[PDB]
Amino acid sequence: AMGEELTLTILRQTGGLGISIAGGKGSTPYKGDDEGIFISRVSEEGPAARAGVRVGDKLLEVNGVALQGAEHHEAVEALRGAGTAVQMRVWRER
C-alpha cells in the first residue's frame, strides 16, 4: 500500500487546532498537481501534534465534511466550524 488512512480526533485547545493547511482546488498545490488539502504545519504546542497529526497528511474529511474537490477557504471554514472535538480523516503517504 502507498499510504495509511487514519482517523484522528483533535480537541480544540486554547483557541485553535494547531495546524495550518495548504492546497485546495485553484490554490497553490502542496504536492505536484494534486489539488487536495494538506497539513502544511503542525504547531509543536498544539493539540493536533499531540493527537498524531503530521505535516504532509492529506485531509479527506473534517467532522463529516468531505474535502475532495474543496477550495482552500472552504476547508478553512470546515475546520473553524467543526466544533470542539474535530474528527479528521487523513491519508498519510509513505
Swiss-Prot record:
Family per similarity comment: Belongs to the LAP (LRR and PDZ) protein family.
Disease annotated for this entry: Neural tube defects: Congenital malformations of the central nervous system and adjacent structures related to defective neural tube closure during the first trimester of pregnancy. Failure of neural tube closure can occur at any level of the embryonic axis. Common NTD forms include anencephaly, myelomeningocele and spina bifida, which result from the failure of fusion in the cranial and spinal region of the neural tube. NTDs have a multifactorial etiology encompassing both genetic and environmental components.
The organism of origin for this protein: Homo sapiens
Domain PDZ: 7-94
Compartmental location: Cell membrane; Cell junction; Cell junction, Adherens junction; Cell projection, Lamellipodium
Post-translational events: Ubiquitinated; targeted for UBE3A-dependent multiubiquitination in the presence of high-risk HPV E6 proteins and degraded.
The protein, known as: Protein scribble homolog
Tissue: Expressed in kidney, skeletal muscles, liver, lung, breast, intestine, placenta and skin mainly in epithelial cells (at protein level).
Gene: SCRIB
Effect of residue 17 to R: Loss of anti-proliferative activity
Modification type Phosphoserine: residues: 43
Assembly mode: Interacts with UBE3A. Interacts with PAK1 and PAK2. Interacts (via PDZ domains) with VANGL2. Interacts (via PDZ domains) with LPP and TRIP6; the interaction is direct. Interacts (via PDZ domains) with TJP2. Interacts (via PDZ domains) with APC; may mediate APC targeting to adherens junctions of epithelial cells. Interacts (via PDZ domains) with TSHR; regulates TSHR trafficking and function. Interacts with ARHGEF7 and GIT1; interacts directly with ARHGEF7. Interacts with CTNNB1. Interacts with MAPK12. Interacts (via PDZ domains 1 and 3) with MCC. Interacts with DLG5.
Its job: Scaffold protein involved in different aspects of polarized cell differentiation regulating epithelial and neuronal morphogenesis and T-cell polarization. Via its interaction with CRTAM, required for the late phase polarization of a subset of CD4+ T-cells, which in turn regulates TCR-mediated proliferation and IFNG and IL22 production. Plays a role in cell directional movement, cell orientation, cell sheet organization and Golgi complex polarization at the cell migration front. Promotes epithelial cell layer barrier function via maintaining cell-cell adhesion.
